[PDB]
Design a protein around this ligand. Structure first.
Ligand SMILES: [Cu+2]
Lengths: 39, 39, 39, 39
């Protein structure tokens, strides 16, 4: 068990979460455009 | 305290967060369908 | 530095993130009700 | 590898995720205002 690897694994997991939330942000931007042009 | 267990616990916590965000994504897809057919 | 404390701190941080995402989920449920009755 | 640094790095990563989710919350508040005045 290399603590350094553990740190790299955790950072990789946090990066994945970040990207997921970012795609959720884009879906909300998408919705807001849908409404902004229709309404 | 087994560092390996600590790593498995952290990975399990990150997996749970991922699934939670995924369900939030599905709720937004749901909303976007609601509006897309009504509007 | 007690690895056990480190684990409890991390779990507490993940719990806080979970609750935050949960409140975001509730805001989306709120929006979906707003639209579902108006539309 | 200083376990303390590892802890500070993890806390910094969790803080970044928190702020990201917070900005997503603000985008949803923004959308809800858009609809609340138009509808
Ligand atoms: Cu984490």
């Amino acid at each position: 068990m290399i603590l350094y690897d553990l740190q790299q694994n955790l950072s990789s997991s946090h990066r994945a979460l970040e990207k997921q939330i970012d795609t959720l942000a884009g879906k909300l931007d998408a919705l807001t455009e849908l409404l902004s042009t229709a309404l």
